[PDB]
């Protein structure tokens, strides 16, 4: 039984797009993806490409702002499934990324289809960087640890919070933390499932598409619920 009208949304392939614009010590730069989401399954692949040549900042520093509805609930959980339940009229996402003895991005999403496309349309600035830290210089490896979110409800603002760090490991050893503060809203007016503390199992893909020669990253995200 589908405990929400938005589950519907999501029994199949949903084509996605994703859009960012973002500001980074006042370096701008623009990444386009298109991809497909397959939340039966819990996963998602999307091609993101640079507009606007090499980007400023490393790739594994943008994969969790750039689709929290493609994650599998558990029949269990169905119930606590906040992201399909807000679809298709959307949520917003926004966080702050607080990088560990360096700068900090905010970020906002707006997550909504438009037509069949689940879109995810994101503002992003950041601030404060160091021009020899493991961000502005690159310094960071292409690949992504897996890690547990844990989602909570935000009653008085309709909506989910969530507060994680992220490890990046570092080039020839060590890891970089990334402390994520993130508020999601609904767009629209109707009713919304809020969830029970749980968490999201996060497993993530690094890669490369041979014959683009922009600065790209294909990614691969499977992601699944567990309760407490």
Do not use: C
Not at 17 to 30: A, I, P, T
Not at 131 to 154: C, R, S, W
Not at 195 to 220: A, C, F, G, I, T
């Amino acid at each position: 039984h589908m405990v929400s009208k938005g589950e519907e949304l999501f029994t199949g392939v949903v084509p996605i797009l994703v859009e960012l614009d973002g500001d980074v010590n006042g370096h701008k730069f623009s990444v386009r993806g298109e991809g497909e989401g397959d939340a039966t399954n819990g996963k998602l692949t999307l091609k993101f490409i640079s507009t606007t040549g090499k980007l400023p900042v490393p790739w594994p520093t943008l994969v969790t702002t750039l689709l929290a509805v493609f994650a599998r609930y558990p029949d269990h959980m169905k119930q606590h499934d906040f992201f399909k339940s807000a679809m298709p009229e959307g949520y917003v996402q926004e966080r702050t990324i607080s990088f560990e003895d360096d700068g900090y991005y905010k970020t906002r999403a707006e997550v909504k289809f438009e037509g069949d496309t689940l879109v995810n349309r994101i503002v992003l600035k950041g601030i404060d960087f160091k021009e020899d830290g493991n961000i502005l210089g690159h310094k960071l490896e292409y690949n992504f640890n897996p890690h547990n979110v844990y989602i909570t409800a935000d009653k008085q603002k309709n909506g989910i919070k969530a507060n994680f760090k992220t490890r990046h490991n570092v080039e020839d050893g060590g890891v970089q933390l990334a402390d994520h503060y993130q508020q999601n809203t609904p767009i629209g007016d109707g009713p919304v499932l809020l969830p029970d503390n749980h968490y999201l199992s996060h497993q993530s893909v690094l890669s490369k598409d041979p014959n683009e020669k922009r600065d790209h990253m294909v990614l691969l995200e499977f992601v699944t619920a567990a309760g407490i």
